[PDB]
Amino acid sequence: ADGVGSSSGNWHCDSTWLGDRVITTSTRTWALPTYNNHLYKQISNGTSGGSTNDNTYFGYSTPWGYFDFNRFHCHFSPRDWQRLINNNWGFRPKRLNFKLFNIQVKEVTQNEGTKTIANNLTSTIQVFTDSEYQLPYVLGSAHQGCLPPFPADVFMIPQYGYLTLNNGSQAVGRSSFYCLEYFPSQMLRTGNNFEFSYQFEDVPFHSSYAHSQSLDRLMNPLIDQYLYYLSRTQSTGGTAGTQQLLFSQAGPNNMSAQAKNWLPGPCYRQQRVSTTLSQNNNSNFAWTGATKYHLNGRDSLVNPGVAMATHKDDEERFFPSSGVLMFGKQGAGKDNVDYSSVMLTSEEEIKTTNPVATEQYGVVADNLQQQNAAPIVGAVNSQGALPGMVWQNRDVYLQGPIWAKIPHTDGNFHPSPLMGGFGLKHPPPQILIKNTPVPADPPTTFSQAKLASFITQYSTGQVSVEIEWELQKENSKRWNPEIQYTSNYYKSTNVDFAVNTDGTYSEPRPIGTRYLTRNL
Amino acid sequence: ADGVGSSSGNWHCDSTWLGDRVITTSTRTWALPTYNNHLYKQISNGTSGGSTNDNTYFGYSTPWGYFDFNRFHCHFSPRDWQRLINNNWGFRPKRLNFKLFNIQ
Amino acid sequence: ADGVGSSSGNWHCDSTWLGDRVITTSTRTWALPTYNNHLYKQISNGTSGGSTNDNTYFGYSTPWGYFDFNRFHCHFSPRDWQRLINNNWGFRPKRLNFKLFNIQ
Amino acid sequence: ADGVGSSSGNWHCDSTWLGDRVITTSTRTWALPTYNNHLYKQISNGTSGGSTNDNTYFGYSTPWGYFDFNRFHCHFSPRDWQRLINNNWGFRPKRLNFKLFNIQVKEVTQNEGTKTIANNLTSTIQVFTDSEYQLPYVLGSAHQGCLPPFPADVFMIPQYGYLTLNNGSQAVGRSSFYCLEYFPSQMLRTGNNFEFSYQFEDVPFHSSYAHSQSLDRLMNPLIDQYLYYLSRTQSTGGTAGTQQLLFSQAGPNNMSAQAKNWLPGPCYRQQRVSTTLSQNNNSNFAWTGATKYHLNGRDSLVNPGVAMATHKDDEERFFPSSGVLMFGKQGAGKDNVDYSSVMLTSEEEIKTTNPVATEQYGVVADNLQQQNAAPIVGAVNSQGALPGMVWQNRDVYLQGPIWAKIPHTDGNFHPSPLMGGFGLKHPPPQILIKNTPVPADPPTTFSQAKLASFITQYSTGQVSVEIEWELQKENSKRWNPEIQYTSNYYKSTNVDFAVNTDGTYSEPRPIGTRYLTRNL
């Protein structure tokens, strides 16, 4: 059986492409510190400080840590991603499998200036998975702390905390406080290992492709319609303008006037920003000119927002202020970092079905005309969903979030995450882990107070997560060649998606999933 | 079997409300020092000192320690206490179960 | 069998809280008059009177009456409502049963 | 089957004396009116009026009525009572059986000055028995409204109401309100009948007998004791009084000094009142000089009190103020009625084991003696229960209550009712009855308000209750004759326990149950 001298598992990273299933397994090495000196702590931010009313919060920061595998590049190598996005229309997860193994718990002490570290063989850790969804589910907010993209990186496990209802910095009566030690957990020593399995609930395949037809152009270019439209309301060419109702059949000449069975997806406008600096207005409109939503007296910037085409044809320089997912390049600052450091994603492929983010949805009439009163047409900046309306969801990326938890609520509309992903009602249960506190020597005379002196301690180990995927094979009679994701053919100082001289891994650009085409 | 590298048990805190039975489990981490340098000692207080006649005693202080779970809040969370006292007229214990494990 | 001198049913008001099911029964005493002297009648309101255009209607008023149990407090006592809303997240009806009896 | 023209049951009054079982059945005719016009009503009394702080209450008066059979003479004829109390030591109920039948519901209306009454054959009544004990249990307070003693009397069913926690006339948050229509009840028309059965929980036989030995006299009159007592602390007869401890054996000469294994029952003193007017003090001490108990700021007279001998030997004129059960003679007023109208019961038979009500329990020392300080002895007026203490319960009467409900509580001491009776934890379930309201003609145009106009209506019928009893036969070797209950041999204007010229039944005297003797 297991013991201090026999390893708890084996390293696995691999991808098994079998028919329609691709099974991706991965493994990393982690280190879990001691957070908050084994304490839960109230954390809050009020408007009495320098903070504003939108930035207030109230919540708790627990000593527990948690594993987050929720980004795609955790599970896919750039070459396995290329096989996926080039050769397949859609993919969805089926089941996953998860393991902790090879647990090394280490005590570390300080004598003057020297440091020394040593195994503690009797120490434990605590691991439970929240499979009844009874805790604040904090995954899916696109926080840092995921497994690294690159299998040779060692990563620090992030601290678990949660937010609760507040009023200002103060808490209200509905505010919940959760004690994570109040669950059953599994205590593991260095010989022990951990495992669980999970099976995804049925979800629509992520549709990875671009339509080969725009929504308005579904017509036959050759044949006229038998339907009529109102072409001309005035007498044409005569010495008088006497109004006369003239009708016409729309056809290849006027295709903007044809009747159509469907409408574009819903529009919620964004502000337009140009990459060229000279064009943008001179002021700071980033927050002020932003598109926000007002909930309970707190203005919240709308990010990334509803899926909407980034820009129209032959304008690549304009992008919606809050609209696009923005990834930073390797080694980029957290605050006020210049444009060249971030990587702006763009949705070109949904221009067909979805309206441009920075432009109006359309035009409606504002008034009832009269012989005296001219007709007036207003702009529709924000448009909810109407019957006969189709749209595309936002695209997933190699760097972006895999799924999200659909909040438990009375109703939702198209419960698909706005960052892109797979909306799940019962998402993969978040896994929590902590170093079991080991006390320093108590006094020899009894004391009621809790023990405030602990041994400085941390643990390390190996974690493996294996997700089975369901692929939708591309079956198409298109004659000409597709567009594929290909690496740059020309020479470069170093390979892309590979280490540099110093060993720093880097991902040069965001890679979306839609290179294939279908008919709209 | 058990050894230096395999843990002796798992953490359990939970409350199972089932019909008329509620089963409350709990777990804590403790530290047991060395009392009296491994000695029994006579202890006493007389009235010959500043003490009065009511406060006199005679007894022994052993090196042994002891577990006391005898308060309610050891076994109940304020929310599990609210389910109890709001929804039920009476309650009595039936049986208990006790474990030490993971000894360092 | 039934007749003029034997009652058609028994009074029932009660609430049976059993596991996940709560079964609420209720009983009332009613009186049904003669409406419209046994007549259907056209009723309407036009804008030619003092009424406005939004308040116009056209319809019929029948001699028939109808039972409406469609409010919650018909079926729940304030104490049975407190057991519901305090101790449970969600509730939905499953089936109902309805009786007229003791007709005078 | 049953109908309007066939009767629902037969009349039964009888007593079956069989071995150790006596089975007493009874039947009466009742009339149940319409109380409160079919309304529950808050009732209260505050101290803001003429009322005092002790007399405040808060509660509700329901339209429902209730059957009370809880007095003995409901179930026993004076001759059946004589067979019981003369020939048997103890008796307890076993089971009962209860029936309503022959239900006549009648409407009554007023035209000018004339009155007219008529059957309503379709009308119902509602009857439930509260067998889960979920209502205020109001039986056992010795209220009026029981079945009449005499089978030929027709009695009016009393109104049901209950009291709840108050503060002043106002109600507190724990105050309960009960709606009796919220139970399942059985609705009966004129053809229907009602029945239920009930089985008494095991109870100690009521001990009906007087002890033939006093508690202190259990000794042998012939033989001395081997034990010694302190007879004399001083030198006797000498020229000096030098204290010397002398001991002696108690015997036939001094039996007050003997050692004894037991003590008398507990004592809570009462004030002594003489029937002779010249002896009593001149003032009104009835309430002021009373023995009361103070509960939640309300002084409550202690009535009848703990069982204690009414008076000692050769004093029949003194009685404890609140101590004795007091029955009124036939046709006596409710308020300030003269002495000759009430019938005072007396406990002679418990003088043996129990202390006299109007006298102290005993004497204890108040101080530690010294050669300087004389010994001081105080009186014990109220004495709780000590180990090695025996007593008798108060006696039941032909007119008095049969049982009581032992309140549901964490603890009780000797849960036997202080009025006398059988304390039951699950007493016979109180039976509630009401006339189902029948509306007067509603208006022809709908109205939200509840229907305030009803048909004036009442019902009548026949009720039967049959109780099986368990007797403890008297088995005794006493040579000489007992004392028996015998009617007056001498002539009189009319028979006792029988009608007078005008048809008025009367019971001339209270009849206790203890004429037999046992050895203490």
Side-chain angles (χ1 to χ4, degrees):
Chain A
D2 58 353
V4 298
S6 178
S7 66
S8 298
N10 295 334
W11 187 270
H12 299 291
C13 298
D14 199 8
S15 62
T16 301
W17 292 88
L18 190 148
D20 57 351
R21 298 289 187 267
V22 55
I23 301 170
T24 60
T25 183
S26 298
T27 305
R28 302 291 185 276
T29 299
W30 51 269
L32 181 284
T34 297
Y35 298 106
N36 285 337
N37 293 286
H38 304 286
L39 295 177
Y40 293 77
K41 291 179 178 179
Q42 172 181 347
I43 56 173
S44 67
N45 190 28
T47 187
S48 178
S51 178
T52 187
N53 189 31
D54 295 345
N55 292 334
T56 60
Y57 64 92
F58 179 89
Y60 296 99
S61 65
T62 65
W64 293 78
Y66 68 96
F67 293 100
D68 189 11
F69 46 90
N70 198 29
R71 299 179 71 180
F72 285 101
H73 61 60
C74 299
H75 306 279
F76 290 94
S77 61
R79 174 55 190 157
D80 285 339
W81 185 251
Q82 196 175 7
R83 295 187 182 91
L84 172 64
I85 67 172
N86 284 343
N87 297 288
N88 288 284
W89 274 342
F91 62 95
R92 60 177 179 184
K94 298 303 284 184
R95 63 179 183 86
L96 65 80
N97 189 339
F98 174 83
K99 293 178 180 177
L100 262 308
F101 57 96
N102 294 337
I103 295 167
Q104 300 93 6
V105 186
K106 294 186 182 302
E107 62 182 341
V108 53
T109 187
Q110 294 301 319
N111 193 30
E112 294 92 1
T114 192
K115 181 186 293 292
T116 186
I117 299 168
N119 288 337
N120 188 337
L121 297 172
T122 57
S123 294
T124 60
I125 59 171
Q126 295 170 335
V127 173
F128 68 95
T129 61
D130 189 8
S131 60
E132 297 179 354
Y133 299 115
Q134 291 171 332
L135 286 169
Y137 178 87
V138 79
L139 299 176
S141 296
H143 295 292
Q144 301 172 337
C146 294
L147 290 54
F150 183 67
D153 293 344
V154 178
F155 68 98
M156 179 174 173
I157 291 176
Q159 189 175 358
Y160 182 81
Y162 61 86
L163 294 176
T164 308
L165 301 175
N166 64 338
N167 186 340
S169 62
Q170 292 171 331
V172 300
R174 294 178 182 83
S175 299
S176 294
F177 167 77
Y178 292 87
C179 182
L180 287 169
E181 291 84 358
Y182 180 69
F183 306 176
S185 69
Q186 183 175 350
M187 300 187 76
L188 293 64
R189 279 179 175 169
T190 189
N192 298 127
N193 60 35
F194 182 82
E195 182 180 1
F196 79 91
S197 297
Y198 167 74
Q199 185 171 353
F200 287 84
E201 63 186 346
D202 291 344
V203 67
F205 289 94
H206 177 62
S207 64
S208 61
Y209 52 77
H211 297 294
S212 63
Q213 285 172 323
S214 63
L215 179 62
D216 48 353
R217 292 292 182 268
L218 293 177
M219 64 193 83
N220 186 333
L222 299 170
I223 310 302
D224 290 348
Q225 286 184 333
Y226 55 85
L227 298 172
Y228 286 83
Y229 68 91
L230 185 36
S231 64
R232 182 180 292 276
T233 308
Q234 187 178 357
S235 64
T236 182
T239 187
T242 61
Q243 61 279 1
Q244 186 65 60
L245 270 63
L246 282 71
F247 295 83
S248 298
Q249 286 182 332
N253 289 336
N254 295 342
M255 301 176 297
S256 62
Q258 294 189 340
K260 304 183 181 76
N261 285 332
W262 304 108
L263 257 56
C267 172
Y268 184 74
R269 188 199 284 265
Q270 292 294 325
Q271 181 60 259
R272 191 186 67 184
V273 180
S274 177
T275 60
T276 301
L277 297 177
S278 296
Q279 294 182 338
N280 289 335
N281 192 339
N282 187 335
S283 63
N284 188 27
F285 57 87
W287 180 254
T288 60
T291 294
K292 291 179 293 297
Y293 71 89
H294 185 67
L295 175 63
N296 195 340
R298 292 179 299 186
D299 290 342
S300 178
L301 177 65
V302 176
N303 193 32
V306 296
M308 294 175 72
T310 303
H311 57 79
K312 62 187 182 69
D313 287 344
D314 290 344
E315 297 174 349
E316 189 179 4
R317 66 184 183 277
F318 299 107
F319 62 94
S321 176
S322 61
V324 294
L325 294 178
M326 302 177 184
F327 298 98
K329 290 170 182 173
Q330 178 60 59
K334 63 177 295 180
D335 288 344
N336 286 337
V337 67
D338 188 5
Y339 172 75
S340 63
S341 297
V342 299
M343 300 183 289
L344 298 175
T345 64
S346 177
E347 293 298 322
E348 187 68 7
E349 296 82 357
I350 60 173
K351 293 192 301 186
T352 63
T353 308
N354 293 342
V356 173
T358 59
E359 291 175 349
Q360 61 185 20
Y361 179 82
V363 169
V364 298
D366 288 345
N367 63 345
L368 277 64
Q369 67 175 17
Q370 293 176 336
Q371 62 177 19
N372 191 28
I376 293 171
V377 291
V380 174
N381 288 335
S382 177
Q383 181 63 258
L386 286 76
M389 177 174 281
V390 298
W391 59 90
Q392 286 297 319
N393 290 335
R394 185 178 294 276
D395 186 6
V396 302
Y397 291 83
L398 180 62
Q399 301 85 359
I402 296 174
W403 64 82
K405 189 185 183 66
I406 301 169
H408 188 277
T409 50
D410 284 343
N412 55 29
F413 180 69
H414 193 63
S416 178
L418 301 185
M419 296 174 186
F422 298 92
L424 293 172
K425 289 194 297 183
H426 299 296
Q430 52 183 15
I431 297 103
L432 280 303
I433 185 169
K434 181 177 65 65
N435 294 131
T436 298
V438 178
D441 53 351
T444 59
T445 303
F446 174 78
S447 177
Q448 62 176 18
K450 66 180 180 180
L451 279 65
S453 180
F454 293 96
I455 294 172
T456 303
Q457 188 168 356
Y458 70 92
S459 61
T460 60
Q462 309 303 323
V463 62
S464 293
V465 57
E466 182 179 5
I467 302 173
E468 181 178 4
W469 296 89
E470 186 181 6
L471 301 173
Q472 193 175 0
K473 65 181 177 182
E474 177 272 339
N475 187 29
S476 174
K477 300 296 282 187
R478 170 179 176 167
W479 179 257
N480 61 343
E482 289 296 329
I483 291 173
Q484 299 300 320
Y485 178 76
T486 183
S487 61
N488 294 336
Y489 175 77
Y490 177 73
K491 65 176 68 180
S492 178
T493 296
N494 53 30
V495 170
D496 293 344
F497 295 93
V499 297
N500 61 28
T501 296
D502 295 345
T504 298
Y505 179 82
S506 65
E507 289 173 341
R509 62 188 62 82
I511 296 172
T513 314
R514 294 170 178 167
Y515 292 95
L516 293 178
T517 57
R518 289 177 69 100
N519 300 132
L520 187 145
Chain B
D2 58 353
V4 298
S6 178
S7 67
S8 298
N10 295 334
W11 187 270
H12 299 291
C13 298
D14 199 8
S15 63
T16 301
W17 292 88
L18 190 148
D20 57 351
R21 298 289 187 267
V22 55
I23 301 170
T24 60
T25 183
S26 298
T27 305
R28 302 291 185 276
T29 299
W30 51 269
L32 181 284
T34 297
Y35 298 106
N36 285 337
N37 293 286
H38 303 286
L39 295 177
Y40 293 77
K41 291 179 178 179
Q42 172 181 347
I43 55 174
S44 67
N45 190 28
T47 187
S48 178
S51 178
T52 187
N53 189 31
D54 295 345
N55 292 334
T56 60
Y57 64 92
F58 179 89
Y60 296 99
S61 65
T62 65
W64 293 78
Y66 68 96
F67 293 100
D68 189 11
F69 46 90
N70 198 29
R71 299 179 71 180
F72 285 101
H73 61 60
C74 299
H75 306 279
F76 290 94
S77 61
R79 174 55 190 157
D80 285 339
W81 185 251
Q82 196 175 7
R83 295 187 182 91
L84 172 64
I85 67 172
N86 284 343
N87 297 288
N88 288 284
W89 274 342
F91 62 95
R92 60 177 179 184
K94 298 303 284 184
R95 63 179 183 86
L96 65 80
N97 189 339
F98 174 83
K99 293 178 180 177
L100 262 308
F101 57 96
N102 294 337
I103 295 167
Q104 300 93 6
Chain C
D2 58 353
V4 298
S6 178
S7 66
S8 298
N10 295 334
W11 187 270
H12 299 291
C13 298
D14 199 8
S15 62
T16 301
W17 292 88
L18 190 148
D20 57 351
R21 298 289 187 267
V22 55
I23 301 170
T24 60
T25 183
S26 298
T27 305
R28 302 291 185 276
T29 299
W30 51 269
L32 181 284
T34 297
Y35 298 106
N36 285 337
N37 293 286
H38 304 286
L39 295 177
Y40 293 77
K41 291 179 178 179
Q42 172 181 347
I43 56 174
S44 67
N45 190 28
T47 187
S48 178
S51 178
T52 187
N53 189 31
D54 295 345
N55 292 334
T56 60
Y57 64 92
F58 179 89
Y60 296 99
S61 65
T62 65
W64 293 78
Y66 68 96
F67 293 100
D68 189 11
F69 46 90
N70 198 29
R71 299 179 71 180
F72 285 101
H73 61 60
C74 299
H75 306 279
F76 290 94
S77 61
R79 174 55 190 157
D80 285 339
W81 185 251
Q82 196 175 7
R83 295 187 182 91
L84 172 64
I85 67 172
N86 284 343
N87 297 288
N88 288 284
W89 274 342
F91 62 95
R92 60 177 179 184
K94 298 303 284 184
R95 63 179 183 86
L96 65 80
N97 189 339
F98 174 83
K99 293 177 180 177
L100 262 308
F101 57 96
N102 294 337
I103 295 167
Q104 300 93 6
Chain D
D2 58 353
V4 298
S6 178
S7 66
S8 298
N10 295 334
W11 187 270
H12 299 291
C13 298
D14 199 8
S15 62
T16 301
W17 292 87
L18 190 148
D20 57 351
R21 298 289 187 267
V22 55
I23 301 170
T24 60
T25 183
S26 298
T27 305
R28 302 291 185 276
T29 299
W30 51 269
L32 181 284
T34 297
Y35 298 106
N36 285 337
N37 293 286
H38 303 286
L39 295 177
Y40 293 77
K41 291 179 178 179
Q42 172 181 347
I43 56 173
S44 67
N45 190 28
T47 187
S48 178
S51 178
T52 187
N53 189 31
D54 295 345
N55 292 334
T56 60
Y57 64 92
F58 179 89
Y60 296 99
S61 65
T62 65
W64 293 78
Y66 68 96
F67 293 100
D68 189 11
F69 46 90
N70 198 29
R71 299 179 70 180
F72 285 101
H73 61 60
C74 299
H75 306 279
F76 290 94
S77 61
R79 174 55 190 157
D80 285 339
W81 185 251
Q82 196 175 7
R83 295 187 182 91
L84 172 64
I85 67 172
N86 284 343
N87 297 288
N88 288 284
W89 274 342
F91 62 95
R92 60 177 179 184
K94 298 303 284 184
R95 63 179 183 86
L96 65 80
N97 189 339
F98 174 83
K99 293 178 180 177
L100 262 308
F101 57 96
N102 294 337
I103 295 167
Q104 300 93 6
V105 186
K106 294 186 182 301
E107 62 182 341
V108 52
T109 187
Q110 294 301 319
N111 193 30
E112 294 92 1
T114 192
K115 181 185 293 292
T116 186
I117 299 168
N119 288 337
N120 188 337
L121 297 172
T122 56
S123 294
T124 60
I125 59 171
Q126 295 170 335
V127 173
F128 68 95
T129 61
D130 189 7
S131 60
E132 297 179 354
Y133 299 115
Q134 291 171 332
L135 286 169
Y137 178 87
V138 79
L139 299 176
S141 296
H143 295 292
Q144 301 172 337
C146 294
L147 290 54
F150 184 67
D153 293 344
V154 178
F155 68 98
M156 179 174 173
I157 292 176
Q159 189 176 358
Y160 182 81
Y162 61 86
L163 294 176
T164 309
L165 301 175
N166 64 338
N167 186 340
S169 62
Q170 292 171 331
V172 300
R174 294 178 182 83
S175 298
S176 294
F177 167 77
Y178 292 87
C179 182
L180 287 169
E181 291 84 358
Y182 180 69
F183 306 176
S185 69
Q186 183 175 350
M187 300 187 76
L188 293 64
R189 279 179 175 169
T190 189
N192 298 127
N193 60 35
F194 181 82
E195 182 180 1
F196 79 91
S197 297
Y198 167 74
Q199 185 171 353
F200 287 84
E201 63 186 346
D202 291 344
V203 67
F205 288 94
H206 177 63
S207 64
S208 61
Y209 52 77
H211 297 294
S212 63
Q213 285 172 323
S214 63
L215 179 62
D216 48 353
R217 292 292 182 268
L218 293 177
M219 64 193 83
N220 186 333
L222 299 170
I223 311 302
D224 290 348
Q225 286 184 333
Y226 55 85
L227 298 172
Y228 286 83
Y229 68 91
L230 185 36
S231 64
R232 182 180 292 276
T233 308
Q234 187 178 357
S235 64
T236 182
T239 187
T242 61
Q243 61 279 1
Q244 186 65 60
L245 270 63
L246 282 70
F247 295 83
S248 298
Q249 286 182 332
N253 289 336
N254 295 342
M255 301 176 297
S256 62
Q258 294 189 340
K260 304 183 181 76
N261 285 332
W262 304 108
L263 256 56
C267 172
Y268 184 74
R269 188 199 284 265
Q270 292 294 325
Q271 181 60 259
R272 191 186 67 184
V273 180
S274 177
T275 60
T276 301
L277 297 177
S278 296
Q279 294 182 338
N280 289 335
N281 192 339
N282 187 335
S283 63
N284 188 27
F285 57 87
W287 180 254
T288 60
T291 294
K292 291 179 293 297
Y293 71 89
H294 185 67
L295 175 63
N296 195 340
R298 292 179 299 186
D299 290 342
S300 178
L301 177 65
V302 176
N303 193 32
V306 296
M308 294 175 72
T310 303
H311 57 79
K312 62 187 182 69
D313 287 344
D314 291 344
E315 297 174 349
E316 189 179 4
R317 66 184 183 277
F318 299 108
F319 62 94
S321 176
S322 61
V324 294
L325 294 178
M326 302 177 184
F327 298 98
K329 290 170 182 173
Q330 178 60 59
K334 63 178 295 180
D335 288 344
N336 286 337
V337 67
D338 188 5
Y339 172 75
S340 63
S341 297
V342 299
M343 300 183 289
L344 298 175
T345 64
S346 177
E347 293 298 322
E348 187 68 7
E349 296 82 357
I350 60 173
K351 293 192 301 186
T352 63
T353 308
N354 293 342
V356 173
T358 59
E359 291 175 348
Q360 61 185 20
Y361 179 82
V363 169
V364 298
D366 288 345
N367 63 345
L368 277 64
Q369 67 175 18
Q370 293 176 336
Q371 62 177 19
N372 191 28
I376 293 171
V377 291
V380 174
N381 288 335
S382 177
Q383 181 63 258
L386 286 76
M389 177 174 281
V390 298
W391 59 90
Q392 286 296 319
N393 290 336
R394 185 178 294 276
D395 186 6
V396 302
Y397 291 83
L398 180 62
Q399 301 85 0
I402 296 174
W403 64 82
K405 189 185 183 66
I406 301 169
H408 188 277
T409 50
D410 284 343
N412 55 29
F413 180 69
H414 193 63
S416 178
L418 301 185
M419 296 174 186
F422 298 92
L424 293 172
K425 289 194 297 183
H426 299 296
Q430 52 183 15
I431 297 103
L432 280 303
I433 185 169
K434 181 177 64 65
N435 294 131
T436 298
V438 178
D441 53 351
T444 59
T445 303
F446 174 78
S447 177
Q448 62 176 18
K450 66 180 180 180
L451 279 65
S453 180
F454 293 96
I455 294 171
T456 303
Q457 188 168 356
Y458 70 92
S459 61
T460 59
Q462 309 302 323
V463 62
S464 293
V465 57
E466 182 179 5
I467 302 173
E468 181 179 4
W469 296 89
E470 186 181 6
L471 301 173
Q472 193 175 0
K473 65 181 178 182
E474 177 273 339
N475 187 29
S476 174
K477 300 297 282 187
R478 170 179 176 167
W479 179 257
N480 61 343
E482 289 296 329
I483 291 173
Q484 299 300 320
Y485 178 76
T486 183
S487 61
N488 294 336
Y489 175 77
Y490 177 73
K491 65 176 68 180
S492 178
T493 296
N494 53 30
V495 170
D496 293 344
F497 295 93
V499 297
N500 61 28
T501 296
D502 295 345
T504 298
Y505 179 82
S506 65
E507 289 173 342
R509 62 188 62 82
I511 296 172
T513 314
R514 294 170 178 167
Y515 292 95
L516 293 178
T517 57
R518 289 177 69 100
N519 300 132
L520 187 144

